[PDB]
């Protein structure tokens, strides 16, 4: 048995040597030359009130105007970002929701949490009222992130250390992704829908193949649990957030620690990470009751977003990049631009 | 400025907001409770007793007061990242069986560690903890069969039921690092039908009284 451990250690050492070999220069050296981005000023254009409980997750629709927010009050609310009107208020069977997402087609919306069930809701029912289409149960751990791969298939991350791709009509997990030493929390979809990356408490980020059903790449370097992860707009890189108060950017091709964002006066963890449309601005939520803008290239604090009285749990940038939403445990959603 | 049915959409938004506010007001009066403990600590038997794969919710109605009990024992996953969602729980019911010394993989040390972890958790500083010690009826003779020294080496009192239970509950209470912020209730429930309900009602009403005094300025 010890031979297997020795082989694994040798393989890890070879991987590390390969990582070091291609580290000719650090991103800071190349990015020092570009002009710095000036202080980015943003204001609370809209304060989407209406929730009476904590906010954990949100998602922007492909139309870049409608968004859905999940709260522990037991209601999923679809908001009109321009008029703030309440499009829908879906009564959840289980109030302990932890994540939600909006279908790219806009005809579906899903959420889940401690109930261990991925509920799929129809937003264009002939009946008129939103109803659950199919309860995609089967996970043995609390759901932590759900993203719609396509209008008829989704990918789910749960606390049972497994990520499963669910077929809507069939009601079964067609593909199962395993290999995480700890519970997997966050998950992001690549722009091409070909790859997705997830992070777990094992302080490692895993890249998986959508159709091959096998692991592709693994990343390490975080000193604590991973909480947030999102793809770079080009899709060839992604930034990951951890409870160690540091945000790190990894490139799939480079396959090594590219750049780490951190400040001395920041000690809280990171709950949500998102990228701007151009990718120059990195937006990450922090538990100190405000969000800080990080320059994706120069790693400088380009700005600070504040106004929430509690931890910011979710944030997302519209597909057009016009505005970025922020959600916190105080039951308030703020749109910035 | 609004169009013909933009006003209609605004009216629908107001209707949805009114319905959501009514539902939230209705739910606020309802009491929320969290049930923690080992699987073999009589959680299922006890929850079934007082009834009037993921998280399980139960509803009770006692003396015109609504209850919400949350069972998360079946959730076999790492804590400290999903427990924080229960920050609003009025009180935590911590069920421990007095008869679990004889099993070693020792459950008493695990239960003490769990109590230390949740009671001292930063998210539950102001919450009240109710200790329902079950399996008293068979503990009555289990204590006779084996002494508490099998699990508590520092124990030196008489090997009596009344003294053994007192020492056990004192030890459980001692784990609380903050005496003033929170109070830990202790009760022996199993083998009874209404006393457990009465104790839960007393604990919840005491918590409400404390909250009223605190927001009145007396705490």
């Amino acid at each position: 048995l010890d031979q297997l451990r020795q082989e694994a250690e040798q393989l890890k050492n070879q991987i590390r040597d390969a990582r070091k070999a291609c580290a000719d220069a650090t991103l800071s050296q190349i990015t020092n030359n570009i002009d710095p981005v000036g202080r980015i000023q943003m204001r609370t254009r809209r304060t989407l009130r209406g929730h009476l409980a904590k906010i954990y997750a949100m998602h922007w629709g492909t139309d870049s105007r409608l968004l859905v927010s999940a709260s522990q009050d037991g209601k999923l609310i679809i908001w009109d970002s321009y008029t703030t009107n309440k499009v829908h208020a879906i009564p959840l069977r289980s109030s302990w929701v932890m994540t939600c997402a909006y279908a790219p087609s806009g005809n579906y919306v899903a959420c889940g949490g401690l109930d261990n069930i991925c509920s799929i809701y129809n937003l264009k029912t002939r009946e008129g009222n939103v109803r659950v289409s199919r309860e995609l149960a089967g996970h043995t751990g609390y759901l932590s992130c759900c993203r719609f791969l396509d209008d008829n298939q989704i990918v789910t991350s749960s606390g049972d250390t497994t990520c499963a791709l669910w077929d809507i009509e069939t009601g079964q997990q067609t593909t199962t992704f395993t290999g995480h030493t700890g519970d997997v929390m966050s998950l992001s979809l690549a722009p091409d829908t070909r790859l997705f990356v997830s992070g777990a408490c094992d302080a490692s980020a895993k890249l998986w193949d959508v159709r091959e059903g096998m692991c592709r790449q693994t990343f390490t370097g975080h000193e604590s649990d991973i909480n947030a992860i999102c793809f770079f707009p080009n899709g060839n890189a992604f930034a990951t957030g951890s409870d160690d108060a540091t945000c790190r950017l990894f490139d799939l091709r480079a396959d090594q620690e590219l750049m780490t964002y951190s400040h001395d006066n920041i000690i809280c963890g990171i709950t949500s990470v998102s990228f701007s449309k151009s990718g120059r601005l990195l937006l990450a939520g922090y538990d100190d009751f405000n969000c800080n803008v990080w320059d994706a290239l120069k790693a400088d604090r380009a700005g600070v977003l504040a106004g929430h009285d509690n931890r910011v749990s979710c944030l997302g940038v519209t597909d057009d990049g016009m505005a970025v939403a922020t959600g916190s445990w105080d039951s308030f959603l703020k749109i910035w631009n | 400025t609004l169009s013909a049915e933009d006003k209609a959409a605004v009216e629908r938004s107001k209707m949805i907001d009114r319905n959501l506010r009514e539902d939230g007001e209705k739910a606020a009066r309802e009491v929320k409770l969290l049930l923690l403990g080992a699987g073999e600590s009589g959680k299922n038997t006890i929850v079934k007793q007082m009834k009037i794969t993921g998280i399980v919710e139960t509803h009770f109605t006692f003396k015109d007061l609504h209850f919400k009990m949350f069972d998360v024992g079946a959730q076999r996953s790492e804590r400290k990242k999903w427990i924080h969602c229960f920050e609003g729980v009025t009180a935590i019911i911590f069920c421990v069986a007095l008869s679990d010394y004889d099993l070693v993989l020792n459950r008493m040390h695990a239960s003490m560690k769990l109590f230390d972890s949740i009671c001292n958790n930063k998210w539950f500083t102001d919450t009240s903890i109710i200790l329902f010690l079950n399996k008293k009826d068979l503990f009555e003779e289990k204590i006779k069969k084996s002494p508490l020294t099998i699990c508590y080496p520092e124990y030196a009192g008489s090997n009596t039921y009344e003294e053994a239970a007192a020492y056990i509950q004192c030890q459980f209470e001692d784990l609380n690092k903050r005496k003033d912020t929170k109070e830990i209730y202790t009760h022996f429930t199993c083998s009874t039908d209404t006393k457990n309900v009465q104790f839960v009602f007393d604990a919840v009403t005491d918590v409400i009284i404390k909250n009223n005094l605190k927001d009145c300025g007396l705490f």
């Epitope: 829908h88 002939r126 009946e127 008129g128 | 169009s3 013909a4 959409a9 009216e11 629908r12």
Partner: single-chain antibody, 232 residues
Framework: VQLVESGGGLVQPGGSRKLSCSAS????????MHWVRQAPEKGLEWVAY????????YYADTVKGRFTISRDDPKNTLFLQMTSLRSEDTAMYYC??????????????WGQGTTLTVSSSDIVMTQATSSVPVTPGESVSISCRSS???????????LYWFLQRPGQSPQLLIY???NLASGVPDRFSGSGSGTAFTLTISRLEAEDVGVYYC?????????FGAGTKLEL
Amino acid sequence: VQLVESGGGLVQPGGSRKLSCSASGFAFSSFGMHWVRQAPEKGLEWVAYISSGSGTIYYADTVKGRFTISRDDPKNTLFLQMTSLRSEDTAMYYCVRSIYYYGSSPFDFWGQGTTLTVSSSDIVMTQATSSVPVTPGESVSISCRSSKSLLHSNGNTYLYWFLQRPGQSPQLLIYRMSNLASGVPDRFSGSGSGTAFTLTISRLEAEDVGVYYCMQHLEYPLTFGAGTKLEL
């Protein structure tokens, strides 16, 4: 989805009646209702509108006061108490289903209708031709014009197109002048500009024969065009 309305018959001039519309198969408690009437040989005409939960109610200038609209969500029924009738009120009455929100399809469903015969600033809709011959496999363009531009400052053009097969209830074809209604064959395609609009049909075939109704929903009272009857 089904809408059943009844309460027709012969009414002497100056009489009263109580029409009803039964709602089933949909969340009537949250959906608004409209009443649109069609004369025995003329086009449609808006009657009344009741919002969700009876929050807001509107009536046409030619029917204000004469009729009152009420609904009972627990009974899933819509009521239209009517009195002081005259010969001008003799017309088919249609129960209309509508929900108002972004991406919604108002006026997407229409009831069968009830026959009620009486014993013997508003926007004006204009249509190019009353009837135009058609042939299967061809394309026909129908043009509709409004007194004022229907493009609101928000960027949405408020045009609704309805088709009524001979003897059947009308159905919604194009809403907002750019989006296809649910369940349509997809042959239709709407386009237009400020005060000018047109409806294009690709590969006209059977079951498309009927009268096309032009509607505006920028400001009440709602008005309807004279209709354009396609004939084979």
